[PDB]
Design a protein around this ligand. Sequence first.
Ligand SMILES: [Cl-]
Ligand SMILES: [Cl-]
Ligand SMILES: [Cl-]
Length: 154
Amino acid sequence: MISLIAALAVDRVIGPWNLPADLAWFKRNTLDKPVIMGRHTWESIGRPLPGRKNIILSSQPGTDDRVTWVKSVDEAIAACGDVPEIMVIGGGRVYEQFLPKAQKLYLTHIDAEVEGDTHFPDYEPDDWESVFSEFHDADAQNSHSYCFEILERR
Ligand SMILES: [Cl-]
Ligand SMILES: [Cl-]
Ligand SMILES: [Cl-]
């Protein structure tokens, strides 16, 4: 099953905030699963995320034997093997091209106004069912209130 995970400020902007809570949610959901990423998230991460196979969806070749470089969506998939779930962690372009094959979304809705270049693709309500939502306040550690939600494609 293909699943997307993303943190969204208002307007579903993905790109400011300091959310340790969002990061332990991200970790708990991708640990021990393949994670499909875009070349820029790669360069911004800079090294393999531990505990996951890293597969990079890029047009030019890789320069890193530590991960899997894939030229397309179907090769992404194929590179993953026989696992119950594949996590799409981002790009905007990546999320856009995987949406149509996704069955689950894991979103962090951060109450925060921002001016960014990228958006999460628009998913359609009559298409997903919200099976989970959990609301949190800003705190000693997390600068903004946030909510965790999971949607399954109905
Ligand atoms: Cl760990
Ligand atoms: Cl949300
Ligand atoms: Cl919500």
